[PDB]
């Protein structure tokens, strides 16, 4: 056979850095049921910023090795952020059942991307009790993957309707998390950031830090 002696790589000409900071360094995250979404395009993305931080504890990725992020190039990257309880983080997984998975935020079975969760007791805990966060409790059925359900209709699931007034046999579907620093780790609020990679053959926009070289012909 003939072994090569040369090796080349060509990447897009863009060099500007895009704001991963405004997703992670945001002062306050939106409610889990109405989870915020930020899209990222046309930049070079460095993942060494996220990886080397100690508090970013729960960093487990589906379909992509976390170490290989530094060189892969993606068409587009989505960022979703919200606030959930300590024991509720394990419920963020494709094909797994659970309250937020059922009614708040579900990952599709064919999901690709990484999920990041870290402790947030130093911002989302009030001694009297925080109620700025809401989570949906009642819904007729499971929510579709990557869907945001902000419906505020008063739930009736029984044989006698109330016709939309919270009298007998009707509850408001949205319940507020009661975060307090005294509670244990199992209920201690956490901040979660979910990255979805649209890995495809289309002309990509977001790439990892890499250096191009001369294009060898023959």
């Amino acid at each position: 056979r003939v072994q090569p002696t040369e090796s080349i790589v060509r990447f897009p000409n863009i060099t500007n850095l895009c704001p991963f900071d405004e997703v992670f360094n945001a002062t306050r995250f939106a409610s889990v049921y109405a989870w915020n979404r930020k899209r990222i395009s046309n930049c070079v993305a460095d993942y060494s910023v996220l990886y080397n931080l100690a508090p970013f504890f729960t960093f487990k990725c589906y379909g992509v090795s976390p170490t290989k992020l530094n060189d892969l190039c993606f068409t587009n990257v989505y960022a979703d952020s919200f606030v959930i309880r300590g024991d509720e983080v394990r419920q963020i997984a494709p094909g797994q059942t659970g309250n937020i998975a059922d009614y708040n935020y579900k990952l599709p079975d064919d999901f690709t991307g990484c999920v990041i969760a870290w402790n947030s007791n130093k911002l989302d805990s009030k001694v009297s009790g925080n109620y700025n966060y809401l989570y949906r409790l009642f819904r007729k059925s499971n929510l579709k993957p990557f869907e945001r359900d902000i419906s505020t209709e008063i739930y009736q699931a029984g044989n006698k309707p109330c016709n939309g007034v919270a009298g007998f046999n009707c509850y408001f579907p949205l319940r507020s998390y009661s975060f307090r620093p005294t509670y244990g780790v199992g209920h201690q609020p956490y901040r979660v950031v979910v990255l979805s990679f649209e890995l495809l053959h289309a002309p990509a926009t977001v790439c990892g830090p890499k250096k191009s070289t001369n294009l060898v012909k023959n």
Partner: antibody
Amino acid sequence: EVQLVESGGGLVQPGRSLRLSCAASGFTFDDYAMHWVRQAPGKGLEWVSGISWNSDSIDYADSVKGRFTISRDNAKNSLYLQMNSLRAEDTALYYCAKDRGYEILTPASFDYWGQGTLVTVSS
Amino acid sequence: DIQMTQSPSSLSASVGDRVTITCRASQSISSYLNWFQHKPGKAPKLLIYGASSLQSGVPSRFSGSGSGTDFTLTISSLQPEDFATYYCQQSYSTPPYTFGQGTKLEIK
């Protein structure tokens, strides 16, 4: 590197009312909490009042309940502290500290500070 | 109700030494304590937020430690600008943002 300038200090008679203002320019102001803290002439720092990112949650120190009012105006990126019903032991130094989070009573503490403005209550 | 007391009031050292200061809590505060550096010539600033987390922009020489009831700040270099007064604060219990007594640090 943020700038927190304070004014309105001076000397007033007991029972009289004066005003404090603190202007913030080195950081985004509409989503940060703020606190007013007191430095005694010969004792340590003592917390006085606080305000959330929006004027929704308000807390006062125990020693000054029902005497001071803390106001915040986002349009001019400044907060005001109205001083009412003063006594002879509020002659300390008052600092304008900035909280890290957005609530009022959180594990987060005072992040950046500013120069204090002296106040004296006597004749 | 919480109480914080500092064993040292005035500490003596030199330019090239190291000294330690402890802050005790009357009741457990779940490691939510902060150390504030207070020069007498200018506005005080924070050094250590949380139990042992260093706030960005201050020299790495300062390092917080301790969790629960007893907390400690340590300094190893003592550059000649470290003459100041240090305070410990708790932010967990219902008496909000109570402070500890001063800790005068002097260089011999």
